[PDB]
Amino acid sequence: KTAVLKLYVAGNTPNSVRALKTLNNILEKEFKGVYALKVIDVLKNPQLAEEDKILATPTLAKVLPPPVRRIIGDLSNREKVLIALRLLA
Amino acid sequence: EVKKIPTMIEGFDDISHGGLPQGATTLVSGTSGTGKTLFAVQFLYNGITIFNEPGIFVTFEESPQDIIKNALSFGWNLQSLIDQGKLFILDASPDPDGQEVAGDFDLSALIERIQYAIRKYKATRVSIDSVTAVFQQYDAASVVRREIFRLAFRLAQLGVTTIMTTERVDEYGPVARFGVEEFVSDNVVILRNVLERRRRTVEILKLRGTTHMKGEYPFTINNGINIFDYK
Amino acid sequence: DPQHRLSQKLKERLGYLGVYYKRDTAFFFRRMSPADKRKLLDELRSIYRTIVLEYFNTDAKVNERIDEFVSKAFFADISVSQVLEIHVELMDTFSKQLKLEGRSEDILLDYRLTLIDVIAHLSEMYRRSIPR
Amino acid sequence: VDPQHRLSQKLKERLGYLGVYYKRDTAFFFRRMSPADKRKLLDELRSIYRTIVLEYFNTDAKVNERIDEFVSKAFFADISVSQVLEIHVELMDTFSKQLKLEGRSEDILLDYRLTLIDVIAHLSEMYRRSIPRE
């Protein structure tokens, strides 16, 4: 019932903007529980992308709930995001 | 009118009339077990130990810890260079716990990580092994293709000399798998390994805008690549 | 200089785009039962103590427990003072343990960088928060 | 007692006097300033911090109110802790070359790490109250 998430984006490209939009509305409306979403621009904070071995943008790295998993893409296929937040089997 | 930097790989600077085109990308293509990875390591190893030019090794399938020990298997201790901060292995291999795809994407983070590593370690030489693996870790060949081009473009702008290793289908056919020779096009080196006993060969298929010895030449793998019989 | 290397580290890891968030007031430190209050406090102590002893080690990754500490501090809304209290108490223990060994307490001063590291991160979450 | 301990007790004392949370005007943030107004702000901060450091550890000084003046300007300008550390480091670098030219020990510079912790601690508490709370 706690989410710690990092969203790695690349500037303000449409894929990144879409992913942030999708991900935000899921957390505030269909998620219940406490969460913190960190949005990181790899063009501005590359070292953070090196630490987490990020290759693609946008990338969603779930820290909590366990186990740690990565989701790539603008997050159009929402179910893959819901399963990670545990809101659906 | 194009300048080259010496690889110091025995016999290569001669068949290539100086070495690799500075500030450019050279493809090094071949089937499995042709010495592409060995070529890529030796390139950076010499750059560091002979010319004190730091290097980045980008790996797409092999883990960094299997690069270092497969290098031991070739006769070189990379961990020393890493510990002096002259060699950096960028881990661009997949996460074994898996990566789920849930929409469209690009490889911007990869490009920025590489640029960042180049500037942090002041590198002038980069090796990328093996770029075809990417096509199999993501199913969007057209964006993968585009990102590889854009990576080459950025590497050029940063004024860095680069080797990209590439898998082949067969010893005599398409130059590189997934048609990467259509974007990274100017400089191509092919490595073959065919049968009594194995025969290994190196061919400089293309080195656009400059001179090179043409055709296949034989080489042996004995503590490095050793090319011979070329006058 | 470890001071120049804390500075460059902060430029590399901080200055995020934004932090979106939802906290529950029921789980703030100040609103917890006396049992849950110090249970939270033992976790913070453990993580920080883990951070400090691994901070100057070359091949360790202190930054993700720094991030775990900060997230934990953030969701409980613990004050900066409480963080400083954790540092001071831990340093006191290190001090009494160092006296029994007859060794210098001068290394303790370098852990002040560790403290600055943590406080910087915690504040950056707040400073980069996108309320509502 | 130990100044680390009474830096500590002093921070607990300041908890009751703060407002529950604060509201700043984004128009007055550092990131929206002209390059000229930006350097105008950073030099005032540099000047104030230098004054804080050199009067820090002085019993008969009112360092806490210049600390409060530094912190207030940095917070309402939305200055980061990172930027504060940069100010400290430059000053310590200046101090270092001046102490070597006088042939004195650079160990006092380590004592100023406490001064830095004092300022950033206050600044960070302001940020903890930069979002709505109850």
Residue boundaries of the structural domains of chain A: 1-89
User: Which amino acid belongs to residue D113?
Assistant: R
Residue C97: domain span:
1-132
Contacts (Cβ under 8 Å, ≥6 apart) of B28: B36, B39, B40, B163, B164, B165, B166, B189, B191
**B220: β partners:** B226
CATH 3.40.50.150 correct for A1-89: no
Alpha helices, DSSP H, located in chain D: 3-17, 35-55, 63-76, 81-100, 108-128
CB-based contact B98 A42, cutoff 8 Å? no
Euclidean distance between CA atoms B156 and B129, whole angstroms: 18
Contact C76, C40 (CB under 8 A): yes
> What's the rounded Cα separation, in Å, for the pair B205 and B211?
11
CA C52 to each of CA C43, C86, C95: distance values in angstroms, whole numbers, following the listed order:
14, 12, 14
Q: Which of B143, B123, B140, B141 minimizes the C-alpha distance to B57?
A: B123
CATH: 3.40.50.10420, 3.40.50.300, 3.40.50.720, 3.40.1160.10. Which one for B1-231? 3.40.50.300
Amino acid found at C25: T
Q: Which two tokens stand for residue B202?
A: 């190196």
CB < 8 Å to D131, chain C: 126, 129, 131
C22 with A28: Cβ contact below 8 A: yes
DSSP for chain B? ---EE----TTHHHHTTSSEETTSEEEEEESTTSSHHHHHHHHHHHHHHTT---EEEEESSS-HHHHHHHHHTTT--HHHHHHTTSEEEEE-SPPTT-EEE-S--B-HHHHHHHHHHHHHTT-SEEEEETTHHHHHHSS-HHHHHHHHHHHHHHHHHTT-EEEEEEE-S-SSS-SSGGGTTTTS-SEEEEEEEE----EEEEEEEEETTS----SEEEEEESSSEEE----
Annotated ligand binding at B206? The verdict is yes
Chain D residues touching residue C10 (CB < 8 angstroms): 81-82, 85
B32 belongs to an annotated ligand binding site: yes
Resolution of the structure, angstroms: 2.6
Taking residue B6's Cβ as centre, other Cβ atoms within 10 Å add up to 15
Q: Which of A25, A30, A39 to mutate to test the interface with C (most CBs of C within 10 A)?
A: A39
SS (H, E, C) B114-161: HHHHHHHCCCCEEEEECCHHHHHHCCCHHHHHHHHHHHHHHHHHCCCE
Which residues in chain A are closer than 8 Å to B138, comparing Cβ atoms?
Answer: 56
Q: How many domains does chain C have?
A: 1
Q: And the tokens for B23?
A: 């500030």
Q: Are B177 and B167 in contact (CB under 8 A)?
A: yes
Distances (CA, A) of A67 to A5, A61, B8: 12, 11, 47
How far B93 CA lies from chain A's nearest CA (Å)?
Answer: 9
CA distances from C108 to C52, C88, C95, D4 (A): 10, 10, 8, 12
Distance from CA of D3 to the nearest CA of C (A): 11
Adjacency order of strands within the sheet including A2-9: B99-101, A69-72, A59-64, A2-9, A34-41, C18-22
Distance CA C21, CA A41 (A): 18
Q: How far is A15 from chain C (nearest CA, A)?
A: 16
Q: What is the DSSP letter of A28?
A: I
Closest of B51, B56, B9 to residue B223, by C-alpha: B9
